[PDB]
């Protein structure tokens, strides 16, 4: 697997835009570019519920979606 070797995220070709679809050959179906979509994970962040107190960015909140907020820690 090469995607994981570069720190990419595997996604369905339906979720992943034809522009983000990489050729790293190492995902369930297609490799998605986290640098083009979102790097909430790469920056040491994770999806958190709206009931959880944390600092979420407007561009990172998109990652999780509606009804969720991408929180980040000092990691």
UniProtKB/Swiss-Prot annotation:
Keywords: Fibrinolytic toxin, Hemostasis impairing toxin, Metalloenzyme inhibitor, Metalloprotease inhibitor, Protease inhibitor, Secreted, Signal, Toxin. GO terms for molecular function: enzyme inhibitor activity; metalloendopeptidase inhibitor activity; toxin activity. GO terms for cellular component: extracellular region. It comes from the Eukaryota. One of its GO terms (biological process) is acquisition of nutrients from host. Its main location: secreted. It is found in: Secreted. Belongs to the protease inhibitor I68 family. Potent competitive inhibitor of metallo-carboxypeptidases CPA1, CPA2, CPB, CPN, and TAF1a. Also inhibits human CPA4. Accelerates fibrinolysis in vitro and may contribute to the maintenance of host blood liquidity during feeding. This is Carboxypeptidase inhibitor. The chain holds residues 23 to 97 of 97 of the full protein.
């Amino acid at each position: 697997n090469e995607c994981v070797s570069k720190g990419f995220g595997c996604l369905p070709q339906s979720d992943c835009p034809q522009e983000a679809r990489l050729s790293y050959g190492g995902c369930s179906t297609v490799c998605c570019d986290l640098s083009k979509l979102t790097g909430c994970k790469g920056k040491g962040g994770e999806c958190n519920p709206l009931d959880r107190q944390c600092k979420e960015l407007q561009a990172e909140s998109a990652s999780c979606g509606k009804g969720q907020k991408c929180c980040v820690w000092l990691h």
